[PDB]
Ligand binder design. Structure first.
Ligand SMILES: NS(=O)(=O)c1ccc(C(=O)NCC(=O)NCCc2c[nH]cn2)cc1
Ligand SMILES: [Cu+2]
Ligand SMILES: [Cu+2]
Ligand SMILES: [Cu+2]
Ligand SMILES: [Cu+2]
Ligand SMILES: [Zn+2]
Length: 259
C-alpha cells in the first residue's frame, strides 16, 4: 500500500512526486526570521471562543493523532486576528521529532521546539471543511510550540489516552476536553499565507503561529513516540518523527501582532 509518511521512501522530500503543489508558491511551514517581521495596524487580537467546544474522539490516523471536535454548529470558533469572518474548530493534532531538540514544523530564527500543536479551523462561508480547504481564505490554523522543560498537566490528559490508540485506525472516546487549555497565557502571533503541512498540501491556510510556547516535559515527549504509523497486524513502525521541514518563503510577508 502506497501512502505517504515520514520514512525513508515516503517522506517529505518525495511528496512532490505525488502532490506537485509541494513545490508551490505558498508552502508551509516556514522559518520566521524575527528581524524581518512586519507590523500591520490592520491586525487584531485573536478571538478564540472555545467555551462551548465539544470534543468527540481521539483518533490515530497513521501520521499523527487528531482530537476531533463537533463542527456542525458554531460551538468553537476563531475570529479576528488576521481573519475576516468566522472559522470553526474541527480538530487539533501535533507534530514532534525523535529527540527533544527537534520536532516543530515552524522555526523561529532557525530554533526548533520539541513539538508543535495545530488547531485547525475552516471558514464557515464555505459550508464545509472540504470546500474551504480548496480556497485561499478557507482555513486558519493556530500553531503553538511545545518547549521542553516542565510537564504540562493539561497535555497529560491527552497523553493518558494514547495507550488506547496505539495503532493506525484506533480511536477512543474523548469528551469534555477544552482546547483552550493548550494555549499560552499571551496570544501574540505571527501570520503568513501558506498551506497544509501534510498531503494534500493545499494552499488554503492563513497561519497564525503563537509567539509564546506552552510547556512539555522530556518524559511526556517519550509518550508521543510510543504511537505507531502502522495498522495492527502490520510490521511495527514507531511514530518517532512527523514534521515537515521549513519550506522556501518565496517573498511572502510574515506579519506580527502586536508587533
Ligand atoms: N498540519 S496542518 O497543516 O495543520 C493540517 C494538515 C492536513 C489537514 C487535513 O487534510 N485534515 C483532514 C481533516 O482533518 N479532515 C476533516 C474532515 C471533517 C469534516 N468535518 C469533520 N471532519 C489538516 C491540517
Ligand atoms: Cu500516508
Ligand atoms: Cu509516493
Ligand atoms: Cu493516511
Ligand atoms: Cu464536515
Ligand atoms: Zn499539523
Amino acid at each position: 500500500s502506497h501512502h505517504w509518511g515520514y520514512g525513508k521512501h515516503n517522506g517529505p522530500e518525495h511528496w512532490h512526486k505525488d502532490f506537485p503543489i509541494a513545490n508551490g508558491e505558498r508552502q508551509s511551514p516556514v522559518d520566521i526570521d524575527t528581524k524581518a517581521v512586519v507590523q500591520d495596524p490592520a491586525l487584531k487580537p485573536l478571538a478564540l471562543v472555545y467555551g462551548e467546544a465539544t470534543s468527540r474522539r481521539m483518533v490515530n490516523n497513521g501520521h499523527s493523532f487528531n482530537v476531533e471536535y463537533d463542527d456542525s454548529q458554531d460551538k468553537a470558533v476563531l475570529k479576528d486576528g488576521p481573519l475576516t469572518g468566522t472559522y470553526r474548530l474541527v480538530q487539533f493534532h501535533f507534530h514532534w521529532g525523535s529527540s527533544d531538540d527537534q520536532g516543530s514544523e515552524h522555526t523561529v530564527d532557525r530554533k526548533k521546539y520539541a513539538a508543535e500543536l495545530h488547531l485547525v479551523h475552516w471558514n464557515t462561508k464555505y459550508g464545509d471543511f472540504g470546500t474551504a480547504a480548496q480556497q485561499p481564505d478557507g482555513l486558519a490554523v493556530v500553531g503553538v510550540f511545545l518547549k521542553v522543560g516542565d510537564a504540562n498537566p493539561a497535555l497529560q490528559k491527552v497523553l493518558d489516552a494514547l495507550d488506547s490508540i496505539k495503532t493506525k485506525g484506533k480511536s477512543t472516546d474523548f469528551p469534555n476536553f477544552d482546547p483552550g487549555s493548550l494555549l499560552p497565557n499571551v496570544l501574540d502571533y505571527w501570520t503568513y499565507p501558506g498551506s497544509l503541512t501534510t498531503p494534500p498540501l493545499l494552499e488554503s491556510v492563513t497561519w497564525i503561529v503563537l509567539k509564546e510556547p506552552i510547556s512539555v516535559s522530556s518524559q511526556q515527549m517519550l509518550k508521543f513516540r510510543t504511537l505507531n504509523f502502522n495498522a495492527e497486524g502490520e510490521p511495527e513502525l514507531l511514530m518517532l518523527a512527523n514534521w515537515r521541514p521549513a519550506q522556501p518563503l518565496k517573498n511572502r510577508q510574515v506579519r506580527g501582532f502586536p508587533k
